[PDB]
């Protein structure tokens, strides 16, 4: 009530170019008539007996009206100085969510258009399930000043609606984003990829790996893998779809280093394929003994 100023520089009030702006006197009791002067231009805009009291409207806001305004009551107790800044209402920000595991996902946002004014963001979400919409829950934003809100302990089968609202001293703009955890899931590549030789088989390479650290322990959703191997300086990749955490190649060239890389995906074909793991190199076993003699 006592001259509601929005978040920003202390002593500034905001408006939109081409529209009509309304200034307010800070140190007033809502009704005490005041006088308005543009500093440097002694032409009084509105006198005390103006009709609307402690505030001031401007017909057509432009850069010539943007500046410093002084309001003082009749008594002689100066309410304060008000600076007019011009800008635009907020536009619906660009929101994009993602997930590395089936339990927690995180969303990011960015303003779709510059407003030029100090801006904050409200983040919320609600489950649509499938029974109906649950109450709105906050999307806790990331600390350290990051534009990122996280959702923890999410339901894999439910469907969410993320609400990112961009707010500046001229209004708000809401961007809703329907998000289903089954669609945005993309795990991290598997770790600990090892390409080993097999004793007694000069054409075999044992490739073993593990689940990524991003996949939680004791999972209810497993991962199916897809492995690609390729001999040294060959152009074509050979794609095999293994079962489990192992794949015994039987097509390797004897005495040639092979490059192997894997990718993961939810076993129910849900989401997309993980990015390719870093390439691991391996050479088949050498079992022919050296130094022969006659017999
Ligand atoms: C997306 O999110 C945005 C922001 O999170 C949201 O816009 C905001 O919605 C809230 C909730 O309706 C608005 O808050 C209202 O504010 C008015 C004016 O101050 C109040 O009168 C309302 O209070 C009533 O309810 C209270 C709760 O019980 C009572 O205690 C109180 O006595 C009143 O009865 C209410 O709080 C808010 O004004 C907007 N705008 C903002 C924050 O800029 C938007 O609706 C969301 N869109 C979705 C979910 O689709
Ligand atoms: C999801 O959040 C929980 C907190 O309840 C945390 O223990 C878990 O590690 C998070 N998931 C991942 C992949 O980090």
């Amino acid at each position: 009530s006592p001259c509601p100023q929005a978040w920003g520089p202390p002593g500034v009030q905001y408006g939109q170019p081409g529209r009509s702006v309304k200034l307010c006197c800070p140190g007033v009791t809502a009704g005490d008539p005041v006088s308005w002067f543009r500093d440097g231009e002694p032409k009084l805009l509105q006198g005390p007996d103006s009709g609307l009291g402690h505030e001031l409207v401007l017909a057509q806001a432009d850069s010539t009206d943007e500046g410093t305004y002084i309001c003082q009551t009749l008594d002689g107790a100066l309410g304060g100085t008000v600076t007019l800044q011009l800008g635009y209402p907020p536009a619906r920000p660009v929101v994009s969510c993602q997930a590395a595991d089936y339990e927690n996902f995180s969303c990011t946002w960015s303003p779709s258009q510059i407003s030029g004014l100090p801006t904050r963001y409200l983040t919320s979400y609600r489950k649509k399930t499938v029974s109906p919409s649950t109450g709105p829950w906050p999307c806790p934003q990331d600390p350290l000043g990051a534009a990122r809100c996280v959702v923890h302990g999410a339901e894999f089968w439910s469907q969410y609606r993320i609400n990112v609202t961009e707010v500046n001293p001229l209004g708000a703009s809401t961007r809703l984003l329907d998000v289903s955890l089954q669609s945005i899931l993309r795990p991290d590549p598997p770790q600990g990829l090892r390409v080993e030789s097999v004793p007694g088989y000069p054409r075999r390479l044992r490739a073993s790996w593990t689940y990524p650290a991003s996949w939680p322990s004791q999972p209810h959703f497993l991962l199916k893998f897809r492995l690609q191997y390729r001999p040294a300086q060959h152009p074509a990749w050979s794609t095999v779809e293994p079962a489990g955490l192992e794949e015994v190649i039987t097509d390797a060239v004897a005495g040639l280093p092979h490059a192997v890389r894997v990718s993961a995906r939810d076993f129910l074909d849900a989401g997309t394929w993980s990015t390719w793991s870093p390439e691991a190199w391996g050479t088949p076993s050498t079992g022919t003994i050296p130094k022969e003699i006659p017999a």
Side-chain angles (χ1 to χ4, degrees), residues 5-198:
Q5 76 145 114
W7 188 73
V12 188
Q13 291 182 45
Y14 313 85
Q16 189 178 165
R19 315 307 196 273
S20 51
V21 306
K22 163 219 261 176
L23 296 193
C24 157
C25 199
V28 85
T29 54
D32 293 351
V34 302
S35 300
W36 294 92
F37 292 102
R38 256 292 296 260
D39 190 56
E41 311 188 356
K43 291 188 294 184
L44 179 66
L45 273 68
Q46 273 185 196
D49 200 359
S50 66
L52 50 86
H54 68 268
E55 27 190 17
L56 174 58
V57 304
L58 286 80
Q60 290 164 337
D62 287 325
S63 175
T64 44
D65 293 347
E66 171 187 293
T68 302
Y69 294 77
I70 311 163
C71 60
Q72 65 181 39
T73 180
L74 319 95
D75 284 347
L78 216 173
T81 314
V82 172
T83 297
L84 179 56
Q85 177 60 42
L86 290 171
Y88 304 98
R92 308 188 306 166
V94 164
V95 185
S96 57
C97 302
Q98 44 184 91
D101 56 80
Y102 60 91
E103 285 183 340
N104 321 329
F105 70 92
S106 67
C107 300
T108 59
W109 63 84
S110 307
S112 65
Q113 188 177 335
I114 47 96
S115 54
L117 279 36
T119 306
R120 305 272 67 170
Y121 289 81
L122 292 324
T123 61
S124 58
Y125 75 97
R126 61 172 66 205
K127 301 184 173 187
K128 292 185 283 184
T129 325
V130 173
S131 62
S133 157
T134 56
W137 283 318
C139 199
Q141 303 188 8
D142 197 67
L144 310 163
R148 183 174 91 95
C149 85
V150 202
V151 168
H152 294 274
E155 184 180 7
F156 188 82
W157 305 112
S158 152
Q159 179 167 126
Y160 294 79
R161 170 156 294 191
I162 274 73
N163 175 355
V164 168
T165 295
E166 172 184 331
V167 288
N168 63 18
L170 297 184
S173 207
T174 299
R175 170 77 78 181
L176 304 149
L177 192 74
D178 280 352
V179 160
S180 72
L181 197 41
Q182 202 188 325
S183 169
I184 67 174
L185 176 67
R186 180 180 200 193
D188 290 325
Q191 297 175 355
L193 176 56
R194 301 178 178 185
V195 192
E196 298 170 31
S197 62
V198 186

Side-chain angles (χ1 to χ4, degrees), residues 246-259:
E246 212 192 20
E247 180 52 53
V248 175
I249 312 179
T250 63
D251 211 302
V253 180
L256 263 189
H258 289 68

